[PDB]
Amino acid sequence: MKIAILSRDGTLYSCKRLREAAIQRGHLVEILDPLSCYMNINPAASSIHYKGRKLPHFDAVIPRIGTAITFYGTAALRQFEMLGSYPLNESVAIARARDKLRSMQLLARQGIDLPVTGIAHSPDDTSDLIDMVGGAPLVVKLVEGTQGIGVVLAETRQAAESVIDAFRGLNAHILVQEYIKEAQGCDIRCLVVGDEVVAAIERRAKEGDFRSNLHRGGAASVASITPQEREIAIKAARTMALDVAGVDILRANRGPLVMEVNASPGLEGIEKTTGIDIAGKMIRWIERHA
Amino acid sequence: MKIAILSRDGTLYSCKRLREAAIQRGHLVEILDPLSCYMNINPAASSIHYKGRKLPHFDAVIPRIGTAITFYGTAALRQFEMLGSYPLNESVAIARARDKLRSMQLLARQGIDLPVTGIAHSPDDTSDLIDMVGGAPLVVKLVEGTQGIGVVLAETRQAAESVIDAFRGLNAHILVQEYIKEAQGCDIRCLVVGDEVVAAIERRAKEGDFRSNLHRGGAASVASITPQEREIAIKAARTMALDVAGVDILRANRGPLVMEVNASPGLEGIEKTTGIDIAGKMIRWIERHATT
Amino acid sequence: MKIAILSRDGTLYSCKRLREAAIQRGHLVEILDPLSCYMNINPAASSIHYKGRKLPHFDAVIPRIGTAITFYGTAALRQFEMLGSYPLNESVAIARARDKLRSMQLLARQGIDLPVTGIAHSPDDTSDLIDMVGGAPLVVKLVEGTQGIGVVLAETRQAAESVIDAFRGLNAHILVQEYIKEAQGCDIRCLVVGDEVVAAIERRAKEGDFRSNLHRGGAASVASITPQEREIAIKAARTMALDVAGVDILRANRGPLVMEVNASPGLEGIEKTTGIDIAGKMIRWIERHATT
Amino acid sequence: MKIAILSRDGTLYSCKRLREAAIQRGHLVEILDPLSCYMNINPAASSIHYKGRKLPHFDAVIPRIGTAITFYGTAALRQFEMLGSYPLNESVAIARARDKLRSMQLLARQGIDLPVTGIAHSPDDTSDLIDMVGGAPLVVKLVEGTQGIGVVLAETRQAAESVIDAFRGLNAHILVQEYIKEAQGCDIRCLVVGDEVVAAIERRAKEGDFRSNLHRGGAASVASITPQEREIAIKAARTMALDVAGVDILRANRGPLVMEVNASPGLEGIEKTTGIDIAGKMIRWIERHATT
Ligand SMILES: Nc1ncnc2c1ncn2[C@@H]1O[C@H](COP(=O)(O)OP(=O)(O)NP(=O)(O)O)[C@@H](O)[C@H]1O
Ligand SMILES: Nc1ncnc2c1ncn2[C@@H]1O[C@H](COP(=O)(O)OP(=O)(O)NP(=O)(O)O)[C@@H](O)[C@H]1O
Ligand SMILES: Nc1ncnc2c1ncn2[C@@H]1O[C@H](COP(=O)(O)OP(=O)(O)NP(=O)(O)O)[C@@H](O)[C@H]1O
Ligand SMILES: Nc1ncnc2c1ncn2[C@@H]1O[C@H](COP(=O)(O)OP(=O)(O)NP(=O)(O)O)[C@@H](O)[C@H]1O
Ligand SMILES: [Mg+2]
Ligand SMILES: [Mg+2]
Ligand SMILES: [Mg+2]
Ligand SMILES: [Mg+2]
């Protein structure tokens, strides 16, 4: 089979592993920077050009589309889909998953448990919003945030007022979210391929922090996930219409809460922590559905 | 009926006209800034709060969501939808429609005639790209995400090459498009409501300009649209799953080409030029498809 | 005399009132959007063009530059200065005044009394920084370059810690400031023209806020200001090398403290609350210092 | 003496070389991240804290403040200055140098030869602007651009029209500049320390390109600088009151033209291309001008 990996990070571990795994299974592989594809849209069916050349047909495309290029990357992916390529994650679902508020609304509407989460942009009554979510302790987050930057624990009502008031000046969407204190700074990161969780690790915040992000000094280790946790990760991915998804879970008293769904999970940390061949399993899903 | 109009621009002509027409037909109307809505999304479909107060149920919501606020705006609209409010244009269709690339791809894929159009972001062979749409004169449209940056005519291959080179590295993608010179700065805006074109104007670009948008100096006149153009406007609107849309058509030598489908068309120019009660048609659509 | 008013807002009260007042006194006024000015900077001091024409010489220019467009704004003002125009606030002083950190560093170095104020960006010991100013309650001011993001009250040490933590990584710096509650949510906004306070007001935040800001629930009476307070306000304006300046003072047990110096103070609130012709005082100062 | 290097980039080549060179010459050195510095500004000239501790007095500070942090870095620098440290480049001069329009206006007004350079932001007559600068061929570039991104050669009038129209949608300051064809894509980068040029390199653009930037394929070699070019680089640095500066020069038919002045020139390319110990020369300047 002929497989395109659609990513700007072709030098990086996850793309190199997907290429190696596909070649090892006898497939032909090309790594394509989405930003280098250009194409006639009207007329439709028109072939994709790349560095002055006309790309061949690809049986499958593996999109690995950075947050910064979602709109154009999915446009390139959409073109491959119209030419008949099988996509490991559809353009429609990648664009939806990039929309964090929409994704959370969908998850909540389909029965998936999440922390009590309020959304706001320019709220004019800070106390009302704090009470609407249920009072301190609260985690305030910027929706378009990464690496734990703009994610803060407001333990008291006054901290929550001050943080929400300060974030107002930024003209940005925010989450105000119930603090899962009993998780003790740990989250469970599952990687879902198809109908199964293929791998899971635990990420643990440093002492003095509650954010498990690696960039914020988090530590990864092998996890023991429950049947319920497996089930919620698989159901979250299916609800998002993703064939491949990272799902981050917080362990609350009342059960697992889905915190995040990522359409382009990194392979390095979870593969190296667990020893599982995740890239191989992505390739096998492709073999079974293209 | 209780109708919310979702817009930051509650003072502007179109929001006032929608309010006026629904009030005249007996409906209770609130004009709500999406950015002032705050709400629990979990648990599902919790009430929407607004300036210290919890909002009542609305039977319908009219989204007039600004270009710079799609993500939050559509989330607010989606919350109304999960609360049971009927939307004049759904959140999903609105979000898709803001994506010009995705929309042109969908219209082309569904067989609607458009000008020859290539897309690019960081092309590494500009000559190949220009050749893709057949050379200058060309229109280049530059976009950051879904926000339009600008639309320029490039009269020579050199001009087009310079524009594309200029934007390399600026995180903007590029629509390169055949120039419909025979339009001589005129396009045809059809305003679709439900299954009808309810008004149609011809917009004529200023002197020394190809861009006929009234907000740049366009002169508007009433247009007489062929049944071909009328069926194309309605099919363009239905393909995008939009209940209200403005469909811009260029009259090329070979036939009518769709240029743009807009989920939130301005009402002022078209209402004044045609004297049609367009806001009223929108309220009627609501009356016919919303419950209670 | 021929007078240019440099502002994006030739629509709003202050600019119309400045043009009105200047015409009243026999001057020819033109309101010019700085962003519409274009010019050669080399050749040194070339003539400024504007919407297709070469502008005439202006004997004076009144800069009313918006926060958001300082770099081009001051550049255009600088060019007028080089062409010989008299500036009502020159570009060097305007540029320095937009930089709060630098400006307070100047005012304190020049011996004016301010609230205890600390600055930080990504401090690694937030309690050290809070103890630097004397603990909570604190005011925290978030700034991006020269553009204020917001001002908040931290009633506790925990709240202050959390605001600082919240902004780590956001590319904003932080002023931490002793909170003047004995000022009971009210500040004094004096308007300095040259050597005199032309008007002074007590501005009172709504019961429910500490920001005595006028865009946020303005209540304001005519003020009765100390001899020391007149001295201070004029001295603040002059240390900043500003000819026209709003000076906001906070009333403290310790004496009066300068809280802000604004090169481009609004006229509407202050003029109607005092009836004073402040624009007229500005035009007069031009008459007194613009040669011909 | 005790020397602080004020830089985010403590592990990068230039700061390591400065630290090495200062240590070799017997000084005590500390690399300090400006963003980790925090301090009272009122009261004036109190100690600078850093990761919980009070910093000792430094006899000299070497600022290496990135563009994105100009305003906070220079505030930190100013505080060291107020505490008596000698700065290798004063904060006020670094702050002005970050303002490219202001710096070009200053160099031009002081009689330093630059290319003819028009500035614009929202020009409303593209043709008038093009003619004001002198006509095609022109280089159009974003004022805030870096590495040559957003720098484009418009060889013809129509290319210039299209590029300028396209850039207008960015809401950004632009330069429209005489194109120095006879330079053949080479620029001379001089590094001035005090009253001399201590090193110079020629950067030559890749084939088919005119931009000599490293990231656009530029090739560095050792340069043969004329007495005239030496004098202009030193005078350009002196005019902007910088003690250390990179000065980029184009060789035009009429003479050398200053294209750029950088207060924080990188050391790696120029040192490795020439074999000159530049860091040591910066330390030597400090020894000659800083009291211990
Ligand atoms: N409600 C919460 N309760 C407890 N811990 C939380 C909560 N929200 C976030 N965290 C922790 O903070 C980390 C960062 O939050 P997260 O929402 O993942 O933002 P992000 O990583 O910066 N952006 P994204 O890539 O979209 O996840 C999580 O991985 C958790 O360890
Ligand atoms: N291919 C084309 N050929 C001829 N005229 C065109 C073409 N594309 C656009 N125009 C003209 O340019 C005008 C502006 O086009 P348009 O694509 O609608 O951009 P815009 O309204 O200025 N901003 P946006 O609608 O967000 O892209 C149109 O109304 C036409 O009059
Ligand atoms: N230390 C303080 N103690 C008491 N009140 C303060 C203090 N600092 C600021 N305020 C209040 O906050 C208001 C606004 O803060 P300010 O420092 O003026 O920030 P800003 O950039 O000017 N935003 P704004 O003034 O509202 O346009 C002032 O007018 C005061 O009423
Ligand atoms: N007017 C001009 N004539 C000829 N070549 C030019 C001209 N302007 C720029 N160049 C070339 O293009 C390169 C990039 O232009 P430049 O103005 O230096 O922008 P930049 O380096 O990407 N941003 P900056 O860090 O501020 O210098 C220069 O180094 C020259 O090689
Ligand atoms: Mg996360
Ligand atoms: Mg349009
Ligand atoms: Mg103020
Ligand atoms: Mg350069």
UniProtKB/Swiss-Prot annotation, chains B, C, D:
<dbReference type="GO" id="GO:0036211">
    <property type="term" value="P:protein modification process"/>
</dbReference>
<keyword id="KW-0464">Manganese</keyword>
<keyword id="KW-0648">Protein biosynthesis</keyword>
<feature type="domain" description="ATP-grasp">
    <location>
        <begin position="104"/>
        <end position="287"/>
    </location>
</feature>
<keyword id="KW-0547">Nucleotide-binding</keyword>
<feature type="binding site">
    <location>
        <position position="260"/>
    </location>
    <ligand>
        <name>Mg(2+) 1</name>
    </ligand>
</feature>
<feature type="binding site">
    <location>
        <position position="187"/>
    </location>
    <ligand>
        <name>ATP</name>
    </ligand>
</feature>
<keyword id="KW-0460">Magnesium</keyword>
<comment type="similarity">
    <text>Belongs to the RimK family.</text>
</comment>
<dbReference type="InterPro" id="IPR011761">
    <property type="entry name" value="ATP-grasp"/>
</dbReference>
<dbReference type="InterPro" id="IPR013815">
    <property type="entry name" value="ATP_grasp_subdomain_1"/>
</dbReference>
<dbReference type="GO" id="GO:0042802">
    <property type="term" value="F:identical protein binding"/>
</dbReference>
<keyword id="KW-0067">ATP-binding</keyword>
<feature type="binding site">
    <location>
        <begin position="178"/>
        <end position="179"/>
    </location>
    <ligand>
        <name>ATP</name>
    </ligand>
</feature>
<dbReference type="InterPro" id="IPR041107">
    <property type="entry name" value="Rimk_N"/>
</dbReference>
<feature type="binding site">
    <location>
        <position position="260"/>
    </location>
    <ligand>
        <name>Mn(2+) 2</name>
    </ligand>
</feature>
<feature type="binding site">
    <location>
        <begin position="211"/>
        <end position="213"/>
    </location>
    <ligand>
        <name>ATP</name>
    </ligand>
</feature>
<dbReference type="GO" id="GO:0009432">
    <property type="term" value="P:SOS response"/>
</dbReference>
<feature type="binding site">
    <location>
        <position position="262"/>
    </location>
    <ligand>
        <name>Mn(2+) 2</name>
    </ligand>
</feature>
<feature type="binding site">
    <location>
        <position position="262"/>
    </location>
    <ligand>
        <name>Mg(2+) 2</name>
    </ligand>
</feature>
<dbReference type="InterPro" id="IPR013651">
    <property type="entry name" value="ATP-grasp_RimK-type"/>
</dbReference>
<feature type="binding site">
    <location>
        <position position="141"/>
    </location>
    <ligand>
        <name>ATP</name>
    </ligand>
</feature>
<keyword id="KW-0479">Metal-binding</keyword>
<dbReference type="Pfam" id="PF08443">
    <property type="entry name" value="RimK"/>
</dbReference>
<protein>
    <recommendedName>
        <fullName>Ribosomal protein bS6--L-glutamate ligase</fullName>
        <ecNumber>6.3.2.-</ecNumber>
    </recommendedName>
</protein>
<dbReference type="InterPro" id="IPR004666">
    <property type="entry name" value="Rp_bS6_RimK/Lys_biosynth_LsyX"/>
</dbReference>
<dbReference type="Pfam" id="PF18030">
    <property type="entry name" value="Rimk_N"/>
</dbReference>
<feature type="binding site">
    <location>
        <position position="260"/>
    </location>
    <ligand>
        <name>Mn(2+) 1</name>
    </ligand>
</feature>
<keyword id="KW-0436">Ligase</keyword>
<feature type="binding site">
    <location>
        <position position="260"/>
    </location>
    <ligand>
        <name>Mg(2+) 2</name>
    </ligand>
</feature>
<comment type="function">
    <text>An L-glutamate ligase that catalyzes the ATP-dependent post-translational addition of glutamate residues to the C-terminus of ribosomal protein bS6 (RpsF). Is also able to catalyze the synthesis of poly-alpha-glutamate in vitro, via ATP hydrolysis from unprotected glutamate as substrate. The number of glutamate residues added to either RpsF or to poly-alpha-glutamate changes with pH.</text>
</comment>
<dbReference type="GO" id="GO:0006412">
    <property type="term" value="P:translation"/>
</dbReference>
<dbReference type="GO" id="GO:0005524">
    <property type="term" value="F:ATP binding"/>
</dbReference>
<dbReference type="GO" id="GO:0005737">
    <property type="term" value="C:cytoplasm"/>
</dbReference>
<dbReference type="GO" id="GO:0018169">
    <property type="term" value="F:ribosomal S6-glutamic acid ligase activity"/>
</dbReference>
<feature type="binding site">
    <location>
        <position position="248"/>
    </location>
    <ligand>
        <name>Mn(2+) 1</name>
    </ligand>
</feature>
<dbReference type="InterPro" id="IPR023533">
    <property type="entry name" value="RimK"/>
</dbReference>
<feature type="binding site">
    <location>
        <position position="248"/>
    </location>
    <ligand>
        <name>Mg(2+) 1</name>
    </ligand>
</feature>
<dbReference type="GO" id="GO:0046872">
    <property type="term" value="F:metal ion binding"/>
</dbReference>
